[PDB]
UniProtKB/Swiss-Prot annotation:
GO BP: translation
Source species of the chain: Methanosarcina acetivorans (strain ATCC 35395 / DSM 2834 / JCM 12185 / C2A)
Protein name: Large ribosomal subunit protein eL30
GN (gene name): rpl30e
NCBIfam families membership: PRK01018.1
Record GO cellular component, one term: cytosolic large ribosomal subunit
Domain of life where this protein originates: Archaea
Molecular-function GO term, any one: structural constituent of ribosome
Keyword field: Ribonucleoprotein, Ribosomal protein
InterPro entries: Ribosomal_eL30 (IPR000231), Ribosomal_eL30-like (IPR039109), Ribosomal_eL30-like_sf (IPR029064), Ribosomal_eL30_CS (IPR022991), Ribosomal_eL8/eL30/eS12/Gad45 (IPR004038)
Family per record: Belongs to the eukaryotic ribosomal protein eL30 family.
RNA sequence: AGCGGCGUCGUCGCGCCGUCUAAGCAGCGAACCCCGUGGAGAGCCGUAAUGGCGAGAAGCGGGCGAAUCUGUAAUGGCAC
């Protein structure tokens, strides 16, 4: 769940941000969508409406950010293609 | 700067006054704010200053939106 994200950011297709994740989920190219625990409830409506598997993240977005490689905060992130990673195995 | 008066004038050519125009009506809209795109971090964008940013910056479009300004009212008043 944690080390897989390192390879998901190293290799494969990923997009950071709520809106681009919405677009990827509606398009369906995003195989899985990863969300932080304390995200606003306004985002969960799409993540349930979208058929994409909903991988929870136990932490908050504040520490989700730095582990993903970005100093800022990450609310909802999608990985379009895993490539050299197995975070999808964590999700499905 | 030009035009019309008044003053001074031992010498010079300066000094002062005037050269106006209401509400109403019609048009335009600076900031803030709202929306559609946009995809920015070993960092970028700004302010007199505080600052803003994947919970979406810069940039690009659209919308709501001031005083005041432009025309008319424009023929009234002036040593017409």
């Amino acid at each position: 769940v944690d080390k897989s994200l390192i390879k998901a950011v190293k290799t494969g297709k990923v997009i950071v941000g709520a809106n681009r994740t919405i677009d990827a989920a509606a398009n369906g190219s995003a195989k899985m969508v990863v969300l932080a625990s304390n995200c606003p409830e306004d985002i969960k409506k799409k993540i349930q409406a979208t058929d994409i598997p909903v991988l929870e993240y136990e932490g908050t977005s504040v520490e989700l950010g730095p582990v993903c490689g970005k100093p800022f905060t990450i609310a909802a992130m999608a990985i379009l293609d895993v490539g050299e990673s197995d975070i999808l195995a964590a999700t499905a």
